[PDB]
Amino acid sequence: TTIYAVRHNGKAAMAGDGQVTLGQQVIMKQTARKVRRLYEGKVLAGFAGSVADAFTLFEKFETKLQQFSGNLERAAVELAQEWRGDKQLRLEAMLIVMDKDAILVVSGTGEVIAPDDDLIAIGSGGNYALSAGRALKRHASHLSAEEMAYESLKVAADICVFTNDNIVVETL
Amino acid sequence: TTIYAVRHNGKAAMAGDGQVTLGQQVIMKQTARKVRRLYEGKVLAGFAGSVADAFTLFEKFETKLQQFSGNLERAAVELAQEWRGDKQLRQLEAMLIVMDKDAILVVSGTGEVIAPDDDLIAIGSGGNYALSAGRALKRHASHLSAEEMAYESLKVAADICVFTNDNIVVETL
Amino acid sequence: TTIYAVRHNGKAAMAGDGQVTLGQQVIMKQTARKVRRLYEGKVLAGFAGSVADAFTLFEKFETKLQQFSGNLERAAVELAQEWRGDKQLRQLEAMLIVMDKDAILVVSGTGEVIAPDDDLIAIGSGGNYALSAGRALKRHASHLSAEEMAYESLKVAADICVFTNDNIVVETL
């Protein structure tokens, strides 16, 4: 799994692959959709874990956003301390959220991280898309956010055994 | 244990073996019936796991279907979230297979709800072998019926997996 | 990694993928060729482990093929007891597969030598998936040649195993 988000030239994008793996060994699905639209379509979210846990956190993050009038950082922080508060969800998959202004990553370890260069990724191949995204932002700034997100996922897909090239890109 | 569901040529079939193994070493039963009919004969379900856990998850799922108006996909996800929260029923190992005349779904104890792209999938220790046979059969032997594909895929899994025998029972919707 | 051999209808074939994985996570190569021709082109061999160990065992097996008048079964067995006798290669978890015009054999670090009952067998991460596909094709698609069978069996394994890709090279005898 790899989910990469990038704000570039007033355009925001988030791309994800489609592979689902069981027991770190077998492929069970190739066409999964891991990028979801939240909060009246003003937030692009993604989760590197299971769909049951993803939907549970997506729901709790939506009520936090409605509680704080779309304050992405404050909603993420209280979700993180609520997430760590739960017996069951306290899980090493990470959450990535993004509105028109900020990007954030929320981990089960309670870390809330905003990227320094408006680009970040999660999943088993996230550091590979992050590596390609940074080279693209510096040496290929003529690419759009959607193009950057797609090429970074494609780079990580050829490296990560748990990330395929069935890449879907969502724009805000 | 190997349970396999396939939708082919307008028919739906779910097969399963009958071996019950304890301690990953000893056989105690050879003729178990692992494929059950739910929701007044409209849902075929099976469970890789124990009997009491199967009946528990079977009841919660049928309850979910009546509450969600027969929506298999929405009931499977809600059951998955309920399954993960319950600390007594939480089995990362166990998996659930369900199928109606329209869709097939697998509910993981890890919380994953998977819909097969090719309308065939399997669970259990030998499920990936039946999955391999079924894919080959759907491609190069499409003349076989759904219940024939289900039986032949279970037969291949049984000759490879030590926890799956050839006492195969096929249920057709 | 997946390597699958099949002797079907007077033909022999051995196919392998091309993916090389490090640390069970990262892909370093996609177009590796793991099926090597041995003994004046009369023998096909494959190894599920590393390149260094593959060559070491290939040369030793080639030696004993000259030593035993090209007798695959006896060359395989004494290679197996020397393999186990070496303090180096005893720790290898990968297996070796060899075939000629008349026989298929698998040699292991366990000291195993297996002739398949149906003239088809596989090794590697997804070998059991290609084996299931091959057995289903052998029974319900016997019109396919050995070259198509080995190729189609590998693609089924490639779509399930995360350590096996579709860059499949089929070497026929």
Place this chain on the structure above:
Amino acid sequence: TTIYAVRHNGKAAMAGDGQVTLGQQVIMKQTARKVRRLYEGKVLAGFAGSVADAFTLFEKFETKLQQFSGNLERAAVELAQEWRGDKQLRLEAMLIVMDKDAILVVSGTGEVIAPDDDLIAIGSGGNYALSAGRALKRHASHLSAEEMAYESLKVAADICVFTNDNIVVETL
């Protein structure tokens, strides 16, 4: 540690960082030189382990090259099966070698790998420089091999805690 090699437009390069880490926790040196010239300056080699093990393998690889008249692949293969043969050196650090025609990676696990796209890397941050190098080769082919090797190391340096930005680039 990260050592990245790339052949591009008839030019060959290999870059390495300078950080040395003890116990995966403390930095002991920042200016180490990890890229060495072998075989009359026709081979660029690098090792992701300790300098004693690096020099030992560098010496055995030089005699193999002189034995096989510069056959990089045949020298690497017999070094790998000799490497696995040794009681002590049988070690999870990897070796990278490169002449004017080929690039190779040799692991203590006996793997001899030639890259598909004339670029590869080793070390704790090697997959990050590999990720940036592939995005650069596709979307910034106007860069030279030396420039590509330097930017890939710099990308991996900002990601890997064991890789610093004291990057030295050697060209063949």
Place this chain on the structure above:
Amino acid sequence: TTIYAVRHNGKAAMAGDGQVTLGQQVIMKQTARKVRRLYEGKVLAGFAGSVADAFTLFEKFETKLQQFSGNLERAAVELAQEWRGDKQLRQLEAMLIVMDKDAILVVSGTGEVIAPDDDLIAIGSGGNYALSAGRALKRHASHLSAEEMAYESLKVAADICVFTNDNIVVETL
């Protein structure tokens, strides 16, 4: 410990040894009686674990026998899902065996409920040894009564299992 039940030729019997072992090393008792009569004498039950857990499960099973009009199969299944539902007894590795005039059932901490295909089954350390003896006697010594079969099966297990002695008590129905 070994407890073996058999319904053969219109008779039912359940036998158990008497050895109690602590720490898998030391014998504390030799004449324990592990076969208890339940439900107005119409049910025989045995537990391979400790006395405290045996009584706890015996009373709960006796409750559900009154609750379900003496239906063994359904009382066993809901006892199995409550057993698994308790944070206490979920960790128990021992199994429970129950029988009446018409059925034999084994309930486990795994949530298992198994009806034997041949009306004979066993539990405990040497249950598989008594099971093998019972199946051989069922096929080649069918003239023996259920009481002799259960007794002879236990003595075979006692001569192999270090945790099973010859102080065997056969309770017939």
Place this chain on the structure above:
Amino acid sequence: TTIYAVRHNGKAAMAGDGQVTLGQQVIMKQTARKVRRLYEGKVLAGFAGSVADAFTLFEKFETKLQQFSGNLERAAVELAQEWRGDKQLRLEAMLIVMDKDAILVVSGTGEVIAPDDDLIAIGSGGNYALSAGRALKRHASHLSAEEMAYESLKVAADICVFTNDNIVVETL
């Protein structure tokens, strides 16, 4: 620790040593009293664990005896299933109880054991006093219960590093 009980010739006895060991290595006390009188002096009890756990179980066993009119076996059984029921006490030290008619051993594993020959023991050296007690009952039946209990403890004391010879014998 070793606590041995024996009924012999209408006389009942229970003997215990006095050593207390911390961390299975250091001696902290030599004069501990491990045999206690319960239920109006009609029950001799002993516990092979800590004094806080001993007093807790001694209290729960006394109320069970008063609830069942001195039925030693029924009180022990429901104590055992209550003992296993507790989160904290569910402990590998064992309990030994004895009235004028029966002897019982209750373990944290839920085992309730009456001896076949009216003699039994608990503790790290219990099997050694049990071994000597059985040889004494067969080849030295002229000894009293109190003498038998004392000599069995003394035999176990010279063998078990956690059992000293400060032996106190209580008779019913």
Place this chain on the structure above:
Amino acid sequence: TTIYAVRHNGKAAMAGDGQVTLGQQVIMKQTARKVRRLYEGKVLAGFAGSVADAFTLFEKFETKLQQFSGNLERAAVELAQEWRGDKQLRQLEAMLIVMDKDAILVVSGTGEVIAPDDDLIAIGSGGNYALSAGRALKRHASHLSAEEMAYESLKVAADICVFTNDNIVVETL
């Protein structure tokens, strides 16, 4: 991570780096600000763990600062016994550091509360390296202010600790 506090020559300072590391291998952020101002700007606090836990403990400590008339030592101690009393934060291996105009305190998941003997202390991965630098500067470079001391101590730690960078933010009181 490294956070170092020092009260020297009538001044108070607390400095921290900016590196955030995941899995002890990968850097996700370089410009984090881990020194937060508390209690109407009269208290500086820092946490070596995650952001969620840092805020949780910051708000609880701020509560007890109002609750105890701004008494750092007593607010720290009762925060420590509540921290240990929570089944959540008991498992936290990181420590908390707090200071006002008169005292410096470190609170741990161990239940520890330590006032430094020389009005200087540090926490985090490289805290002991900044502590050593601070003590050497306190003895042989007492002319430096508390702001320069805390800053220089962090740079020494940054050049040794792989989890501490040079993006140091010094908050003075």
Place this chain on the structure above:
Amino acid sequence: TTIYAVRHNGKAAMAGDGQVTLGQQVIMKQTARKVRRLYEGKVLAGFAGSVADAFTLFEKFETKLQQFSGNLERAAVELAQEWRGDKQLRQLEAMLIVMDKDAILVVSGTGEVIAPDDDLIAIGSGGNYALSAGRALKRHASHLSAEEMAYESLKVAADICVFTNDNIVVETL
């Protein structure tokens, strides 16, 4: 940490060191005060463990003393049973030392309440060394006062144990 109590020649003294160690490797404080006065100066108590756990157990013990009319022995046992039941306060590692003008007691997290036969005892990582010195001193150097024996025994423990220093503070009743 080493705390040692001795009653000798009509005087009672309890000594302790001042070293606070984290991670069994690093020193953070050298002048801690581990011997506290309780129950209006009539009880000397110390705690091998953390500060927050010490203050928690100190408060529960003083509460136990007021409820049991100053009975040290009955309060120590009741505190021990309360300590074992509380899953949040349960520390098998930690130990508590208490002493009045009549008795000395040690309360273990394992639940043991020990009264010394020779009216001297110690707790902490270096307690057995101070215990060894104190026994030798009470036998062959009885001319020393109780506070002298307490200091000299701590001084011997400090030169042997790496977790105990010579910053010894002696409190006399």
Place this chain on the structure above:
Amino acid sequence: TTIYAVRHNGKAAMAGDGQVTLGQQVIMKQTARKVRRLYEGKVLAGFAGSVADAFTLFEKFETKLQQFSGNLERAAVELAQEWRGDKQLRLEAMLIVMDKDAILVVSGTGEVIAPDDDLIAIGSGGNYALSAGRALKRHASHLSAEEMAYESLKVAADICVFTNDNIVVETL
């Protein structure tokens, strides 16, 4: 397995059971003979391990006895340091040897132990026969050495799950 030796009233005896257990779970033989005669019938030996290891040590101990003219202690000591010297035999089963004058126990850990009271035992139930043998020597000295050895084994047999009552007693 239990092998017990005792010198008593000028008579020497060594008794052993007959049970052989595989994997600490299953009984494979009930009539094994574990007490062997060595050195012209002047030494009674026993081994608590496998028959292949027993015969190997029995042979090496016989040549040591012939080398030292029947010095039981000196032969046992050099066997023990030779035993620890071997790569394969360096094994937690113990050896027991006995001539007309001394009894010794030799462990794979290099311990050579002569009993203080002319009686000692080895095997999984050795401490139980040792416990009964000491009570018998003190409170039933009218028994012969052969009777004492038999009753001690019989006591250990009813306690140890790995020791049966097929007891053979050999006298010197």
Place this chain on the structure above:
Amino acid sequence: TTIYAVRHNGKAAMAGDGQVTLGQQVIMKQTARKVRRLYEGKVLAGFAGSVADAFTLFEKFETKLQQFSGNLERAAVELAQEWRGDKQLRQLEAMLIVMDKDAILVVSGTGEVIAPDDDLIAIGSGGNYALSAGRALKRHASHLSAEEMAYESLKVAADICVFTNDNIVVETL
């Protein structure tokens, strides 16, 4: 086991207990003599391990005492590097203690050679307890001879260590 050596007031003594323990649980001997006289009676030596290893090291040390003109310190050091150089005795966790009229030395499997700062040292399970007693007696009971000191130090250790008894044999030089 405890062995303690002391050179005090122109006298030298080495004392040891007699308890032999197997499996850290059971006592096999109570009157063992672990202090052996070496090198024409001019050297006392003791080993905290097994008898076989004690003799092996005793003979090797006696060899190097002849080899080095009875120089204890140099014979000890080269014995230490040969001890570590042997693949056998490298795994020994016990230590060796040697003394003559002028020096005391401890040699370890770690390769350690230590001369005590105060001419007294101990080895074995309770060596640190006898060491503490010896240091207290050296400071506050200097009138005792070396023979009484070594004897009294061992009895203190015997009353604390479960692997050390009171059957103490004091060998004077």
Place this chain on the structure above:
Amino acid sequence: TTIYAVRHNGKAAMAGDGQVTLGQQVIMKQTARKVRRLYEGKVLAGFAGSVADAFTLFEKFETKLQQFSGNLERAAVELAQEWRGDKQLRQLEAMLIVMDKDAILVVSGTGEVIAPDDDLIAIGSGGNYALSAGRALKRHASHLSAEEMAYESLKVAADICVFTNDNIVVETL
């Protein structure tokens, strides 16, 4: 153990403490001399580890110096390769410090030969603390001599590390 070498202002100094610890818990010596002079007073060497291993590696290094004509760098690398090959002398834990009037070097048991960029470095359990102090001193207290920096850096390490004491001995070239 902490050994620290610094070259400053035309002078070279190497300091070390005197604590010897066994089992990471108990002190056996407080006045050891860990800094040795080699190569006829031209080389200062120290060893974090045991005595016998120090003398062994000291001898092999001096032999390497005579063979390489006093070349510290070439002798250190050759010793490192020799150290890794010897399976009896291979200590991943141990480290070696050497220094002449020109260079400083550290030889790791992991095989690393490091030359400090700032001409100061340290080894041992508390070496990174002395390294932190020394860097701060070279920057903000350059007026101190090399032997003063060596002592003060060891003094800071000793007050933090539990395995390093203040019995510091400084050797100057």
